[PDB]
Amino acid sequence: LMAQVFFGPTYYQRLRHMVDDKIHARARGPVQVLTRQPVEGRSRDGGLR
Amino acid sequence: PPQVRPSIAMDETTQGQDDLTHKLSDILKANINVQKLEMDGSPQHIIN
DNA sequence: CTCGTGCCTGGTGTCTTGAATCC
RNA sequence: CCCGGUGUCUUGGGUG
DNA sequence: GGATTACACCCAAGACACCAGGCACGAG
């Protein structure tokens, strides 16, 4: 490489936010009894607002 | 109709009623007591 | 055999007084 | 012998 | 007196007290 590269150890920390805890998709699914609209929340197969 | 105030099941079989359902019961109970009270024992203050 | 006493359940239910600035 | 769905109201901490 | 404090997502932890009546158990 025409340029030299800053290189060395650094302490790195692994944070709790991982993609497979966030990814979500909904085709059809459960609805609320009251509004007959898609439910809220990843944990309930919900839809985006 | 029940669509507006649906029942929900807290835990399994147990089901509580919507706030409107409880409140309509209170209006309905209170309506019956006017029936009986207007006819007898109504010396103004009681009705008030 | 008959009375005294504690536990479960349902209908009912209310009150000793004790955060800030725009129109 | 098909079809087949389950929760409501608040509190606390985050993410951007 | 009222009116309001941008939008979206996820996690975990709590839900009704008091008195009258019957029924079951223990003692004389």
Q: Is B14 exposed, middle or buried (0-12, 13-18, 19+ CB in 10 A)?
A: exposed
Tell me the technique behind this structure.
cryo-EM
Helical ranges in B1-48 per DSSP H: 19-39
Nominal resolution in Å?
3.5
Nearest nucleotide to B11, CA against C1' atoms: D7
CB-based contacts of A34-40 (< 8 A; 24+ apart in sequence): A34/B6
The secondary structure of residue A37, as a DSSP letter, is S
- Residue B18's contacts (CB-CB under 8 Å, 6 or more residues apart) are B4, B5, B6, B7, B8
Separation in Å, CA B37 to CA A16, B2, B26, B32: 66, 31, 16, 9
What burial letters (b/e) apply to A7-21, b meaning 16+ CB within 10 Å?
Answer: eeeeeeeeeeeeeee
Q: How far is CA A17 from the centre of its chain?
A: 8
Backbone torsion region of residue A18, taken as left when φ is above 0, otherwise alpha when ψ lies between -120 and 50, otherwise beta: beta
Contact between the CB of B14 and strand D at under 7 Å: no
Asked if B6 has any chain A CB less than 8 Å from its own CB, the reply is yes
- Which residue in chain A is spatially nearest to B18 when comparing CA positions? A34
> Which of A38, A16, A35 minimizes the C-alpha distance to A27?
A38
Residue with tokens 């099941």: B9
